[PDB]
Amino acid sequence: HMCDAFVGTWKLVSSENFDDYMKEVGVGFATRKVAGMAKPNMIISVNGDVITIKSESTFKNTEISFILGQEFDEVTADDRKVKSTITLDGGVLVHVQKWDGKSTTIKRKREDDKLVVECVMKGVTSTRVYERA
Numbered sequence: 001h002m003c004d005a006f007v008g009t010w011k012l013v014s015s016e017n018f019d020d021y022m023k024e025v026g027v028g029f030a031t032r033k034v035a036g037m038a039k040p041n042m043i044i045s046v047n048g049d050v051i052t053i054k055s056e057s058t059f060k061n062t063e064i065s066f067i068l069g070q071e072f073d074e075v076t077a078d079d080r081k082v083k084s085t086i087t088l089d090g091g092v093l094v095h096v097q098k099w100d101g102k103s104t105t106i107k108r109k110r111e112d113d114k115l116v117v118e119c120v121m122k123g124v125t126s127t128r129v130y131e132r133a
């Protein structure tokens with residue numbers, strides 16, 4: 001029942017500062033423009049210990065499955081090859097991606113009827129808000 005309140009189908013309804021986050025990450029111009037336009041559907045499900053998070057959009061359909069605390073290899077939507085570890089900290093899913101001596105952290109939290117996604121790369125934060133689909 002560890003992630004019950006995350007499970008479901010969610011749709012992006014707002015984004016703030018995502019271009020700057022993507023610049024900080026190293027995303028190039030064309031990908032920033034097209035990916036920044038995307039309005040993804042996030043689908044979260046749990047089966048036993050395995051959590052699956054799908055992101056479906058006009059830009060790319062991606063999917064990760066993982067066990068909390070157990071590192072995995074992830075190809076991101078911008079084609080970074082990263083090592084990822086996702087944990088639960090105080091009811092917040094904390095997703096750290098490592099690559100090329102760099103790190104970014106993505107936090108996902110339930111707040112009221114929303115799922116809030118906070119993306120941090122050094123001093124830059126982007127906040128993306130999802131609501132139930």
Ligand SMILES: Cc1ccc(O[C@@H](CCCCOc2ccc(Cl)cc2)C(=O)O)cc1
Pocket residue numbers: 012022025027031032035036038040042055057059060076077078106117119128
């Ligand atoms: C097509 C797409 C565009 C933006 C996305 O935002 C991520 C927020 C979490 C960031 C994950 O890693 C990145 C970093 C940069 C880009 Cl351009 C896409 C994903 C989200 O909303 O789940 C997802 C998908």
